Amino acid sequence: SDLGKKLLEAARAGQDDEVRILMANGADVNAKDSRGKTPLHLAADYGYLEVAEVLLKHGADVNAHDVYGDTPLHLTATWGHLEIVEVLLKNGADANAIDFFGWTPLHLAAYFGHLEIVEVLLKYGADVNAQDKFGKTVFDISVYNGDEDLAEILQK
Amino acid sequence: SDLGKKLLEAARAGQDDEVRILMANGADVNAKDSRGKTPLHLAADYGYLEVAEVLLKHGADVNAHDVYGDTPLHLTATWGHLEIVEVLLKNGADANAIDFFGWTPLHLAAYFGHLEIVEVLLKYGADVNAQDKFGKTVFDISVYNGDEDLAEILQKL
Numbered sequence: 001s002d003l004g005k006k007l008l009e010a011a012r013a014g015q016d017d018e019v020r021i022l023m024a025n026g027a028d029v030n031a032k033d034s035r036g037k038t039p040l041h042l043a044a045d046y047g048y049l050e051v052a053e054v055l056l057k058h059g060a061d062v063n064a065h066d067v068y069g070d071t072p073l074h075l076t077a078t079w080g081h082l083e084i085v086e087v088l089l090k091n092g093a094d095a096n097a098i099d100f101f102g103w104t105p106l107h108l109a110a111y112f113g114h115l116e117i118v119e120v121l122l123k124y125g126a127d128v129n130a131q132d133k134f135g136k137t138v139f140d141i142s143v144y145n146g147d148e149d150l151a152e153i154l155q156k
Numbered sequence: 157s158d159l160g161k162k163l164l165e166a167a168r169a170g171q172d173d174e175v176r177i178l179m180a181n182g183a184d185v186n187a188k189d190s191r192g193k194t195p196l197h198l199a200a201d202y203g204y205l206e207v208a209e210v211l212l213k214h215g216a217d218v219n220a221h222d223v224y225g226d227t228p229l230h231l232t233a234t235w236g237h238l239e240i241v242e243v244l245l246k247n248g249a250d251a252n253a254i255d256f257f258g259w260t261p262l263h264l265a266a267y268f269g270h271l272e273i274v275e276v277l278l279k280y281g282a283d284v285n286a287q288d289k290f291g292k293t294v295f296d297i298s299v300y301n302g303d304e305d306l307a308e309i310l311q312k313l
């Protein structure tokens with residue numbers, strides 16, 4: 001409630017010290033804002049690595065979905081935060097999580113050309129044959145984007 | 157600075173009364189957050205029409221860009237806020253502004269199937285032949301998305 005609101009603002013601001021103080025006083029680690037985003041969503045969205053590690057250590061749901069079905073891994077794969085992608089997958093983030101558009105984090109990472117995240121997601125079991133609600137796979141994204149370096153990864 | 161931070165949080169929360177108080181207090185209408193978004197960006201992002209009109213009445217930059225080159229019109233075209241799209245265009249928003257991906261607001265509206273915003277942008281001079289940095293037009297989006305209704309709007313031009 002009130003502590004959950006201050007935790008969402010502290011996570012959005014990248015204040016890891018403020019997040020630690022809120023955790024010791026029983027703040028809801030999985031409080032949701034107006035779009036269903038948890039503090040881990042915001043730390044993953046803005047690239048706050050040290051904030052995400054504090055949240056995950058205190059029981060943050062690594063596979064929490066917002067109102068659009070996006071997980072914290074969906075947001076990191078969009079903005080290209082390689083270090084947080086690694087921390088999420090180490091804490092049990094589902095590489096095949098799916099939002100309301102049918103997108104896996106592999107879809108969003110392939111759309112925005114974050115190939116280093118694509119290979120890490122493949123290492124953790126991301127399915128290349130997964131189709132979104134528009135019948136698109138990662139192969140179709142490489143053709144649409146003309147990304148030869150992505151198609152060269154999928155060929156292996 | 158201090159007042160601009162509170163204006164950004166007030167616009168993100170949709171408190172048009174709190175915004176008007178900070179406006180009269182001398183807050184910077186074009187204050188930016190860590191991603192370069194103005195209060196008009198946030199009001200356009202979350203669909204707060206009354207907040208966006210208050211900002212525009214007090215000299216908000218209708219064509220402000222964030223760190224990724226997105227204008228408030230780019231955000232409304234993404235989230236399908238039709239009422240704010242018309243308000244921005246009535247206040248002089250560039251209907252053909254591009255971001256770092258070369259996307260016009262017509263590209264983002266066509267990607268997310270916001271056909272009402274597509275036609276409104278066309279009424280304000282949006283170029284259908286505009287290509288992004290990947291050589292994509294709204295015709296390529298209609299074929300890629302398989303949007304029957306979008307391709308029907310484009311062929312009637």
Ligand SMILES: COc1ccc(C(=C2C=CC(N(C)C)C=C2)c2ccc(N(C)C)cc2)cc1
Nearest residue numbers: 078101111112134144145234257267268290301
């Ligand atoms: C704000 O977060 C996002 C998320 C996705 C996109 C985007 C798409 C792609 C496919 C879409 N549909 C509904 C088929 C809808 C939206 C997209 C389209 C093209 C590219 N390229 C070619 C780099 C990247 C992303 C845009 C922004």
